[PDB]
Amino acid sequence: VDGASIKFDSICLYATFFPMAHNTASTLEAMLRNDTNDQSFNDYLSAANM
Amino acid sequence: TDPAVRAALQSQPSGLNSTDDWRQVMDRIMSLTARNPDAFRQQPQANRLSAILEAVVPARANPTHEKVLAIVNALAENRAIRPDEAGLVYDALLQRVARYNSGNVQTNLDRLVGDVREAVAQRERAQQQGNLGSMVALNAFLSTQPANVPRGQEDYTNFVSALRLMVTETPQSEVYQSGPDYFFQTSRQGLQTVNLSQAFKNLQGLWGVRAPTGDRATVSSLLTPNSRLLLLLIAPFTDSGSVSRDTYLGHLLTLYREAIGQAHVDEHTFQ
Structure with missing residues (x-):
């Protein structure tokens, strides 16, 4: 009720790639695809809210 | 790993x-x-x-x-x-x-x-x-070369067998054909490349007649340095008596064989 307003003119997504030695990156990519080396994550406020 | x-x-x-x-x-x-x-x-x-x-x-x-x-x-x-x-x-x-x-x-x-x-x-x-490919190339080259030498034959075939043994007994050695010639590199990424075809062509004329002339350095300039390297690389092979002595080729082989010999021996001695 105070006339505050905001518009998005444009938006872009940025990313940063670590320049890895191609053979090392290739072997890492090979290893990371097997089931035994799957990545896992959890969350700090592991929780639930109510 | x-x-x-x-x-x-x-x-x-x-x-x-x-x-x-x-x-x-x-x-x-x-x-x-x-x-x-x-x-x-x-x-x-x-x-x-x-x-x-x-x-x-x-x-x-x-x-x-x-x-x-x-x-x-x-x-x-x-x-x-x-x-x-x-x-x-x-x-x-x-x-x-x-x-x-x-x-x-x-x-x-x-x-x-x-x-x-x-x-x-x-x-x-x-x-x-031992890299059978080099052996195949060498046999092809030897088939290209004639097997008959009008002046002397035992020394020639003895030397041929010695070369065969040398290429067989030392792996990592390369025998191949790049142009209209055959070569012999003592190692991949290695120096000492011998023009095998040129060496044999030069050596064809020195097999059975350089024995009496070994005492005088009148024909010693006929040996092109490439063939000299080729002979040097076969000093450890073709032991005494394989090539008839008192021959310029035989004299060079004996000298080179004696030299390399003192060396390795002294070296394993070290300290």
Whole structure:
């Protein structure tokens, strides 16, 4: 009720790639695809809210 | 790390002491292990139960990735592709298998991992065994060369056998043909390349007539330096009496053989 307003003119997504030695990156990519080396994550406020 | 593509693979798709080797886990969980018994009896409950639950009913696994990675690694260690190409071709083969899969395909894949393991081992031992390709090239060149020398023949064929023995007995030596000539490199990325065709052409005229003329350095300039290197490389071979002595060629061979000899001997002595 105070006339505050905001518009998005444009938006872009940025990313940063670590320049890895191609053979090392290739072997890492090979290893990371097997089931035994799957990545896992959890969350700090592991929780639930109510 | 390890050349055996099975071993150099299985480091990548595997846990550590999981229920892939069921017998060891079952031995350790009851009491059977003697190295450190009662280890499992005193872990937290969850862990204990979970192993036990894993042990009584094993969980099936999908070994497609393991086999495909094994064959890819075999290709990489055998110079079939570059390592970047290895990273790409792993996914390529994975898609290929996944879009045509069948029990027959898995059977052929196991056959193939066995075959590539054997292939890598064979390639390594053959590369350390003498490089038959050089022998084939040398035999082709010798077929190109004539086998008859009007002045002297025993020395010529003795020298030919000596050269054959030299190329056979030292692996990593290269014999090939680049232009309209055959050559002999004592090592990959190595100096001392001998123009074999030119050396034989020059040496054809010195076989059976340089024995009486060895005392006077009147024809000594006929020996082109390339052929001199060729003779120098065969000093350890063609031991005394193989080439008839009192011959300019024989004299050079004997001198070179004596020189190299004092050297290696003194060297293993060192200190």
